[PDB]
Design a protein around this ligand. Structure first.
Ligand code: NA
Length: 330
């Protein structure tokens, strides 16, 4: 079997991407943030504290003839951005782009932090990292991909994020029309539960390529590209008036600037992020100071190839016995 779903940026900056997911019988469609950096499928629901819902579509398990309470199961998660959610668990029928999993753990939120309430466009998360990160207790649960894997034509899913435009998540097949040239595959460590891999270096604009290993995670749930402070300083040094602002919380640049591209290596291959992709616009409405798309990973304790880097590529998440990543230009 296969599935194929369109993913749509939630706003004009590509802050995140929502994909419609069918839950239950009859189907309840919710717009979920597919997150290769986490392993919980959780939703706004009929159980979510009323004051903490502000325009989201909710899952109502009592209206689903296939929902069953997973008795005694709870979950609680804390993301890199300080946001959080928690609640109890149902099993139900979950379909993404025509691919159906029966008995999927659907984690129903009783509580969500302010950043979730404040985003009316995201109905929940669908994690696509390794199931060893799933937070359900006392019985850890499998991701949608882990449940689907055995039924898929090939044990893979692909992320084809758009720049200010819709993209695609495909499950169980590589669309050979969606990229140019060849896919370059690179080794993955699952030691941290992430799609963790080692980039072979970087270049800034038309600059020479610096050969250097950069360990990091491929994370569709993180907006920006977080890299070591050396690399990030080398990038913003090429932008007149760019500086790191304590008060704003990272690199800002004059909104009059033309930003240079950023290239990252995948083995002997090169993925070029156009300069436009690194522009996250004014820091506040009306400001001439703009927020950078490339930021320091210092403090975070890991490098993160977030949407700024991934949307420049056709990315293959190979869930074979020995998992690998694939990157192609497109
Ligand atoms: Na922000």
């Amino acid at each position: 079997s296969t599935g194929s779903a369109t993913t749509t940026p939630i706003d004009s900056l590509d802050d995140a991407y929502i994909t419609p997911v069918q839950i239950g019988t009859p189907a309840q469609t919710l717009n979920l943030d597919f997150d290769t950096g986490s392993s919980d499928l959780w939703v706004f629901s009929s159980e979510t504290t009323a004051s903490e819902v502000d325009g989201q579509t909710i899952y109502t398990p009592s209206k689903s003839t296939t929902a069953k309470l997973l008795s005694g199961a709870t979950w609680s998660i804390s993301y890199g951005d300080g946001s959080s959610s928690s609640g109890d668990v149902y099993t139900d029928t979950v379909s993404v782009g025509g691919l159906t999993v029966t008995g999927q753990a659907v984690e129903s939120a009783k509580k969500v932090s302010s950043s979730f309430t404040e985003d009316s466009t995201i109905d929940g998360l669908l994690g696509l990292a390794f199931s060893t990160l799933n937070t359900v207790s006392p019985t850890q649960q499998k991701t949608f991909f882990d449940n689907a894997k055995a039924s898929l034509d090939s044990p893979v899913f692909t992320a084809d994020l758009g720049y200010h435009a819709p993209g695609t998540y495909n499950f169980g097949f590589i669309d050979t029309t969606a990229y140019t040239g060849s896919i370059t595959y690179t080794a993955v460590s699952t030691k941290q539960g992430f799609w963790e891999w080692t980039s072979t270096g970087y270049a800034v604009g038309s600059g020479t390529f610096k050969s250097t290993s950069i360990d990091g995670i491929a994370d569709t749930g993180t907006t920006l590209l977080y890299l070591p402070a050396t690399v990030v300083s080398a990038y913003w040094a090429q932008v007149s008036g760019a500086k790191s602002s304590s008060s704003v919380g990272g690199y800002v640049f004059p909104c009059s600037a033309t930003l240079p591209s950023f290239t990252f290596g995948v083995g002997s291959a090169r993925i070029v992020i156009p300069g436009d992709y690194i522009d996250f616009g004014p820091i506040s409405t009306g400001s001439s100071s703009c927020f950078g798309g490339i930021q320091s990973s210092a403090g975070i304790g890991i490098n993160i190839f977030g949407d700024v880097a991934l949307k420049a590529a056709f990315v293959v998440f190979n869930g074979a016995t020995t998992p690998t990543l694939g990157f192609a230009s497109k």
